[PDB]
Amino acid sequence: KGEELFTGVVPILVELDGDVNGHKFSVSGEGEGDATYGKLTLKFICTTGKLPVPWPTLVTTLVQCFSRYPDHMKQHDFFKSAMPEGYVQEMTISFKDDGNYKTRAEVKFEGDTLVNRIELKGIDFKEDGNILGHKLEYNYNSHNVYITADKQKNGIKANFKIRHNIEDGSVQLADHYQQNTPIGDGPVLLPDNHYLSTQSALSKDPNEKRDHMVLLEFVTAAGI
Ligand SMILES: [Mg+2]
Protein backbone atom coordinates (compact mmCIF):
# COMPACT_ATOMS: atom_id res chain seq x y z
CA LYS A 1 0.00 0.00 0.00
CA GLY A 2 1.14 3.35 -1.19
CA GLU A 3 0.99 5.48 1.98
CA GLU A 4 3.50 3.13 3.67
CA LEU A 5 6.17 4.45 1.26
CA PHE A 6 5.87 7.96 2.71
CA THR A 7 6.30 7.53 6.47
CA GLY A 8 9.87 8.85 6.34
CA VAL A 9 12.03 11.26 4.34
CA VAL A 10 12.02 10.35 0.65
CA PRO A 11 14.55 11.63 -1.91
CA ILE A 12 13.04 13.47 -4.86
CA LEU A 13 14.28 13.99 -8.43
CA VAL A 14 12.54 16.30 -10.89
CA GLU A 15 13.38 16.46 -14.62
CA LEU A 16 11.60 18.87 -16.96
CA ASP A 17 12.00 19.49 -20.66
CA GLY A 18 10.28 22.64 -21.86
CA ASP A 19 9.53 24.58 -25.02
CA VAL A 20 7.82 27.98 -24.60
CA ASN A 21 7.28 29.87 -27.87
CA GLY A 22 10.23 27.94 -29.32
CA HIS A 23 12.53 28.68 -26.40
CA LYS A 24 13.84 25.26 -25.39
CA PHE A 25 15.04 24.59 -21.85
CA SER A 26 15.53 21.87 -19.22
CA VAL A 27 15.35 21.94 -15.45
CA SER A 28 16.76 19.40 -13.02
CA GLY A 29 15.74 19.34 -9.36
CA GLU A 30 16.88 17.43 -6.31
CA GLY A 31 15.66 17.38 -2.74
CA GLU A 32 13.49 15.51 -0.30
CA GLY A 33 9.94 15.22 0.93
CA ASP A 34 8.52 14.32 4.32
CA ALA A 35 4.78 13.81 3.94
CA THR A 36 4.39 13.43 7.72
CA TYR A 37 4.86 17.22 7.83
CA GLY A 38 3.65 17.95 4.29
CA LYS A 39 7.13 19.29 3.69
CA LEU A 40 9.21 19.67 0.52
CA THR A 41 12.73 21.07 0.16
CA LEU A 42 14.12 21.25 -3.37
CA LYS A 43 16.74 23.00 -5.46
CA PHE A 44 16.13 23.37 -9.20
CA ILE A 45 18.75 24.25 -11.80
CA CYS A 46 18.24 25.32 -15.39
CA THR A 47 20.75 23.05 -17.09
CA THR A 48 20.52 24.70 -20.50
CA GLY A 49 21.43 28.24 -19.48
CA LYS A 50 19.08 31.05 -18.49
CA LEU A 51 15.47 30.10 -17.94
CA PRO A 52 13.31 31.76 -20.61
CA VAL A 53 10.28 32.11 -18.33
CA PRO A 54 10.03 33.22 -14.67
CA TRP A 55 10.77 30.55 -12.10
CA PRO A 56 7.46 31.08 -10.27
CA THR A 57 5.55 30.06 -13.40
CA LEU A 58 7.04 26.55 -13.12
CA VAL A 59 6.30 25.83 -9.43
CA THR A 60 3.02 23.96 -10.01
CA THR A 61 4.59 21.84 -12.73
CA LEU A 62 7.77 20.99 -10.77
CA VAL A 63 4.54 15.94 -6.31
CA GLN A 64 1.29 16.09 -4.35
CA CYS A 65 2.00 12.64 -2.93
CA PHE A 66 4.00 14.62 -0.32
CA SER A 67 0.87 16.39 0.97
CA ARG A 68 0.02 15.85 4.62
CA TYR A 69 -3.37 14.11 4.74
CA PRO A 70 -4.72 14.24 8.29
CA ASP A 71 -5.44 10.78 9.69
CA HIS A 72 -9.18 11.35 9.49
CA MET A 73 -8.82 12.06 5.74
CA LYS A 74 -6.35 9.33 4.80
CA GLN A 75 -9.03 7.52 2.74
CA HIS A 76 -8.97 10.50 0.38
CA ASP A 77 -5.29 10.45 -0.58
CA PHE A 78 -5.28 9.43 -4.22
CA PHE A 79 -1.69 10.45 -4.76
CA LYS A 80 0.00 8.03 -2.36
CA SER A 81 -2.47 5.28 -3.23
CA ALA A 82 -1.16 5.20 -6.79
CA MET A 83 2.38 4.48 -5.59
CA PRO A 84 4.78 2.95 -6.34
CA GLU A 85 3.61 2.49 -9.94
CA GLY A 86 2.68 6.18 -9.99
CA TYR A 87 0.37 8.55 -11.78
CA VAL A 88 0.24 10.72 -14.88
CA GLN A 89 -0.44 14.39 -14.15
CA GLU A 90 -1.63 16.59 -17.02
CA MET A 91 -2.30 20.30 -16.70
CA THR A 92 -3.48 23.18 -18.78
CA ILE A 93 -2.20 26.43 -17.35
CA SER A 94 -3.93 29.44 -18.91
CA PHE A 95 -2.18 32.74 -18.17
CA LYS A 96 -4.86 35.46 -18.31
CA ASP A 97 -4.35 37.81 -21.26
CA ASP A 98 -1.39 35.69 -22.37
CA GLY A 99 -0.32 32.20 -23.44
CA ASN A 100 -0.73 28.75 -21.97
CA TYR A 101 1.33 25.83 -20.76
CA LYS A 102 0.31 22.25 -21.40
CA THR A 103 2.15 19.73 -19.26
CA ARG A 104 2.37 15.96 -19.00
CA ALA A 105 4.24 14.39 -16.12
CA GLU A 106 4.81 10.91 -14.76
CA VAL A 107 5.32 10.71 -11.00
CA LYS A 108 6.53 7.35 -9.72
CA PHE A 109 9.19 5.59 -7.68
CA GLU A 110 12.51 4.64 -9.21
CA GLY A 111 13.82 2.45 -6.46
CA ASP A 112 13.47 4.39 -3.23
CA THR A 113 13.40 7.78 -5.03
CA LEU A 114 10.26 9.67 -6.02
CA VAL A 115 10.69 10.97 -9.58
CA ASN A 116 8.67 13.64 -11.39
CA ARG A 117 9.40 13.63 -15.12
CA ILE A 118 7.74 16.40 -17.11
CA GLU A 119 7.27 17.67 -20.64
CA LEU A 120 6.02 21.27 -20.84
CA LYS A 121 4.81 23.06 -23.98
CA GLY A 122 3.99 26.78 -23.93
CA ILE A 123 2.39 28.61 -26.83
CA ASP A 124 0.96 32.01 -27.71
CA PHE A 125 2.92 34.03 -25.21
CA LYS A 126 3.27 37.76 -25.75
CA GLU A 127 6.84 38.87 -26.25
CA ASP A 128 6.44 41.79 -23.83
CA GLY A 129 3.91 40.08 -21.58
CA ASN A 130 4.55 39.28 -17.93
CA ILE A 131 5.97 35.82 -18.73
CA LEU A 132 8.38 36.34 -21.62
CA GLY A 133 9.02 39.87 -20.37
CA HIS A 134 10.08 38.56 -16.92
CA LYS A 135 7.81 40.93 -15.01
CA LEU A 136 6.90 38.50 -12.24
CA GLU A 137 8.24 38.92 -8.74
CA TYR A 138 10.32 36.10 -7.27
CA ASN A 139 7.78 35.05 -4.67
CA TYR A 140 4.71 32.87 -4.30
CA ASN A 141 1.29 33.21 -2.67
CA SER A 142 -0.59 30.59 -0.70
CA HIS A 143 -3.33 28.71 -2.60
CA ASN A 144 -5.96 26.00 -2.30
CA VAL A 145 -5.89 23.19 -4.87
CA TYR A 146 -9.48 21.93 -5.18
CA ILE A 147 -9.65 18.21 -5.79
CA THR A 148 -12.56 16.17 -7.08
CA ALA A 149 -12.81 12.51 -8.08
CA ASP A 150 -12.97 11.49 -11.70
CA LYS A 151 -14.47 8.05 -11.34
CA GLN A 152 -14.57 7.15 -14.99
CA LYS A 153 -10.83 7.73 -15.31
CA ASN A 154 -10.13 6.11 -11.94
CA GLY A 155 -8.39 9.30 -10.86
CA ILE A 156 -8.83 12.92 -9.87
CA LYS A 157 -9.25 16.39 -11.28
CA ALA A 158 -8.06 19.64 -9.77
CA ASN A 159 -8.98 23.20 -10.41
CA PHE A 160 -7.31 26.27 -9.00
CA LYS A 161 -6.10 29.76 -9.82
CA ILE A 162 -2.54 30.82 -9.13
CA ARG A 163 -2.04 34.54 -8.45
CA HIS A 164 1.44 35.59 -9.58
CA ASN A 165 2.56 38.96 -8.23
CA ILE A 166 3.67 41.38 -10.97
CA GLU A 167 6.49 43.83 -10.28
CA ASP A 168 4.14 46.83 -10.58
CA GLY A 169 1.68 45.63 -7.90
CA SER A 170 -0.76 43.89 -10.21
CA VAL A 171 -1.54 40.16 -10.46
CA GLN A 172 -1.03 37.71 -13.29
CA LEU A 173 -3.65 34.97 -12.98
CA ALA A 174 -2.74 31.44 -14.05
CA ASP A 175 -5.82 29.25 -14.23
CA HIS A 176 -5.03 25.53 -13.70
CA TYR A 177 -7.05 22.53 -14.89
CA GLN A 178 -5.40 19.29 -13.75
CA GLN A 179 -6.10 15.61 -14.34
CA ASN A 180 -4.32 12.71 -12.66
CA THR A 181 -4.67 9.05 -13.60
CA PRO A 182 -2.93 6.00 -12.20
CA ILE A 183 -0.19 4.25 -14.13
CA GLY A 184 -0.73 0.91 -12.41
CA ASP A 185 -3.75 -1.40 -12.44
CA GLY A 186 -4.07 -1.63 -8.67
CA PRO A 187 -6.91 0.04 -6.82
CA VAL A 188 -6.60 3.68 -5.89
CA LEU A 189 -8.43 5.95 -3.48
CA LEU A 190 -11.07 8.12 -5.10
CA PRO A 191 -11.60 11.10 -2.82
CA ASP A 192 -14.52 13.24 -1.71
CA ASN A 193 -14.16 16.87 -2.58
CA HIS A 194 -11.43 18.52 -0.57
CA TYR A 195 -8.51 20.84 -1.05
CA LEU A 196 -4.77 21.08 -0.54
CA SER A 197 -3.63 24.20 1.28
CA THR A 198 -0.22 25.05 -0.14
CA GLN A 199 2.42 27.54 1.04
CA SER A 200 5.67 28.09 -0.89
CA ALA A 201 8.83 30.10 -0.26
CA LEU A 202 11.32 30.81 -3.02
CA SER A 203 14.97 31.64 -2.41
CA LYS A 204 18.47 31.61 -3.88
CA ASP A 205 21.61 29.65 -3.01
CA PRO A 206 24.21 32.38 -2.41
CA ASN A 207 26.94 30.14 -3.78
CA GLU A 208 25.17 29.21 -7.01
CA LYS A 209 25.98 31.00 -10.29
CA ARG A 210 23.63 28.93 -12.44
CA ASP A 211 20.02 30.03 -12.93
CA HIS A 212 18.18 28.21 -10.16
CA MET A 213 15.38 28.17 -7.58
CA VAL A 214 15.39 26.96 -3.97
CA LEU A 215 11.87 25.97 -2.86
CA LEU A 216 10.44 25.24 0.59
CA GLU A 217 6.81 24.11 0.43
CA PHE A 218 4.16 22.91 2.85
CA VAL A 219 1.03 21.17 1.62
CA THR A 220 -1.82 20.08 3.85
CA ALA A 221 -5.11 18.44 2.92
CA ALA A 222 -8.24 20.00 4.38
CA GLY A 223 -11.92 20.57 3.75
CA ILE A 224 -13.39 17.46 5.31
MG1 LIG B 1 -1.50 29.86 -33.70
Swiss-Prot record:
Annotated organism of origin: Aequorea victoria (Water jellyfish)
Outcome after substituting residue 201 to V: In EBFP1.2; shifts the excitation and emission spectra to shorter wavelengths and increases quantum yields compared to BFP
Consequence of changing residue 64 to H: In P4; leads to no detectable fluorescence. In mut2.2; shifts fluorescence lifetime from 3.03 to 1.94 ns. In mut3.3; shifts fluorescence lifetime from 3.03 to 1.88 ns
Effect ascribed to mutating residue 140 to F: In Sapphire/H9-40; exhibits a huge Stoke's shift, with an excitation peak at 399 nm and an emission peak at 511 nm. In Azurite; shifts the excitation and emission spectra to shorter wavelengths and increases quantum yields compared to BFP
Name of this chain's protein: Green fluorescent protein
Result of altering residue 219 to R: In Azurite; shifts the excitation and emission spectra to shorter wavelengths and increases quantum yields compared to BFP
Disulfide-bonded cysteines: none
Effect listed in the UniProt record for changing residue 198 to H/W/F: Results in significantly red-shifted excitation and emission maxima
Tissue expression from the record: Photocytes.
Outcome reported for the amino acid change (mutating residue 193 to S): In EBFP1.2; shifts the excitation and emission spectra to shorter wavelengths and increases quantum yields compared to BFP
Keyword Cell cycle attached: no
Similarity comment text for this entry: Belongs to the GFP family.
Biotech / industrial applications: Green fluorescent protein has been engineered to produce a vast number of variously colored mutants, fusion proteins, and biosensors. Further generation of mutants led to more stable proteins (at 37 degrees Celsius for example) with brighter fluorescence and longer fluorescence lifetimes.
Effect of residue 67 to A: Increases fluorescence at warmer temperatures such as 37 degrees Celsius. In GFPmut 3; highly fluorescent mutant when excited at 488 nm
Consequence of substituting residue 193 to I: In mut2.1; shifts fluorescence lifetime from 3.03 to 2.50 ns
